[PDB]
Ligand binder design. Structure first.
Ligand SMILES: Nc1ncnc2c1ncn2[C@@H]1O[C@H](COP(=O)(O)OP(=O)(O)CP(=O)(O)O)[C@@H](O)[C@H]1O
Ligand SMILES: Nc1ncnc2c1ncn2[C@@H]1O[C@H](COP(=O)(O)OP(=O)(O)CP(=O)(O)O)[C@@H](O)[C@H]1O
Ligand SMILES: Nc1cncn1[C@@H]1O[C@H](CO)[C@@H](O)[C@H]1O
Ligand SMILES: [K+]
Ligand SMILES: [K+]
Ligand SMILES: [K+]
Ligand SMILES: [K+]
Ligand SMILES: [Mg+2]
Ligand SMILES: [Mg+2]
Lengths: 297, 297
């Protein structure tokens, strides 16, 4: 089953010499997408980018990695996001924010649709996301909502709670980090908010706990899934890598049951880790071979 | 005599490999300024930048090159212009340079030179800085060199361009324009059919730059042509600005100008125009005095 990823793709510029910048592939939706593909899963990216040098570069990365870019509309009246890292935002109306409902493909039953709160920041992309999730549900598809909070990017932070809630309603599964549970709920202890979304309408919650692995909150109870122990070298991209692994596994069958869900979180942690022993985000994502060599240690 | 340059200072990102960007000081006003300074002339930059990375960085380049930055202010609320050369992707929406205002203008003295392009006329504040700037310099007995450096894309509604160009040429002691801009300016397939466009707008001295050809001088005494040196193109980015820098350096060596000085200025302008096209980056190959001579010959 195909895995649709909708959202942001941007170019991060990192120093190389006293007079150069290395252009790295970035974006939460982008990493997740490359992740699923780089694991042999069928993944399509739904989004928007500028026809500038950056957007073309990005589109190439998707292709080098096996990500279907048929619904990645490259426009010329738009500007692809470029960031200076030290971190910095040069382009603000942002091109990935213009992706709209008419940028969405037809969905098929058992397909998965992904999106984070990041794509809910600016109005156009907001409809693509909410309409996107509604359509996939209507088609007998699954929605995985990853609250990937970045308040800073939000104009009126008063919209956050509302969108998150309306998202948990459409979603089949919600992924959230312990820190986010505290931000949204206000509690100091995340476990005091482990039912935040469950009350907001999502019968299956996956709480990433950093090195402590994951916590599954379903109707019957909560099950802890510890993570492999490793040499923390850089936690960047970890969460996105985690979701990619989860989506890759879930897409391996029409219905997901007990065993599949438990297997997905295991895979999610594996990816999350390898995406921490290395450096970078997209360049930490493993290939089926590396995952095993790492898994069996 | 001091040469004042008012306008844009930016970071030009020049694509090296299909994975890197070359970081170079950019901006038309910036290049011209660094050009005059390198040649040993007294040049001050009048402008605005963000207390940001590109801003502090850029300020540093002006200092390494001998450009007086006493009237260049860095505002934290602003964002220094960053762009990508291809032909120009404008990352930063408005852009700090847009905020120069008449108050930022410095007291002018007699025989000094004031420079500005249509680029500084694009947005609201800076527009006044330029037009009042040129008016004050004239009132002080100084000279104004207007370089129509057309970049239509960066504008609101291009209906303002003809009007501003006309008001500028009125204030100009000398107008510099490229064959190409003339057409774009006054509908035409061939520039010659419009080489009196500005002259009919109030500028009795016009210098039309002609790519690798050199330039054509136009004063009542008649029309004259100057041949540009035989050089190998690597990057044209900056030719025009290097051209004006050389012109301003020569004109500022005297209190009055005429054919002798003027004819010498254009010769120097071509020399610089040639050299600058021999390296990636707008101000990379901007020559020092020693170098200007070994090339002259
Ligand atoms: N120190 C560590 N050792 C092993 N695995 C780790 C790890 N730190 C993180 N991980 C893996 O990365 C996963 C996701 O990272 P984490 O739990 O820190 O959320 P996050 O903050 O990266 C996502 P967000 O950006 O949305 O807040 C963890 O659940 C775990 O699988
Ligand atoms: N190919 C070439 N070989 C040698 N010199 C060249 C050259 N191209 C340009 N030059 C030099 O630079 C000068 C200006 O070139 P050109 O007119 O193309 O710049 P430009 O069109 O960018 C001006 P503007 O900034 O107003 O648009 C030429 O007159 C010449 O002196
Ligand atoms: N600042 C600017 C806006 N659009 C283009 N530019 C500048 O034009 C100069 C060449 O004349 C380049 O250095 C570029 O930064
Ligand atoms: K739901
Ligand atoms: K990492
Ligand atoms: K005039
Ligand atoms: K150049
Ligand atoms: Mg985090
Ligand atoms: Mg030009």
């Amino acid at each position: 089953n195909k895995v649709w990823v909708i959202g942001d793709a941007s170019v991060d510029l990192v120093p190389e010499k006293q007079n150069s910048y290395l252009k790295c592939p970035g974006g939460a939706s982008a990493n997740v997408g490359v992740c699923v593909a780089r694991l042999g899963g069928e993944c399509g990216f739904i989004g928007c980018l500028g026809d500038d040098d950056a957007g073309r570069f990005l589109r190439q990365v998707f292709q080098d990695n096996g990500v279907d870019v048929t619904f990645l509309r490259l426009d010329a009246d738009l500007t692809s996001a470029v960031l200076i890292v030290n971190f910095t935002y040069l382009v603000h109306p942002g091109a990935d924010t213009y992706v709209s409902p008419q940028d969405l493909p037809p969905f098929r039953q058992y397909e998965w649709f992904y999106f984070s709160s990041i794509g809910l920041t600016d109005r156009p992309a907001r409809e693509a996301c909410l309409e996107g999730a509604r359509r996939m549900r209507e088609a007998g598809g699954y929605v995985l909502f990853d609250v990937n909070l970045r308040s800073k990017m939000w104009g009126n932070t008063d919209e956050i709670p509302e969108l998150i809630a309306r998202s948990a309603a459409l979603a089949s599964i919600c992924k959230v980090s312990a820190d986010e549970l505290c931000q949204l709920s206000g509690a100091s202890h995340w476990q005091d908010a482990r039912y935040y979304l469950r009350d907001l309408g999502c019968d299956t919650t996956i709480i990433s706990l950093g090195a402590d692995g994951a916590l599954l909150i379903t109707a019957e109870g909560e099950f802890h899934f510890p993570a492999p122990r490793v040499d923390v070298v850089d936690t960047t991209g970890a969460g996105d890598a985690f979701v990619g692994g989860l989506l890759f596994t879930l897409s391996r069958a029409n219905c997901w049951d007990h065993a599949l869900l438990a297997e997905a979180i295991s895979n999610a942690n594996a990816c999350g880790a390898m995406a921490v022993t290395a450096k970078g985000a997209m360049t930490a994502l493993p290939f089926p071979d590396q995952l095993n060599t790492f898994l069996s240690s």
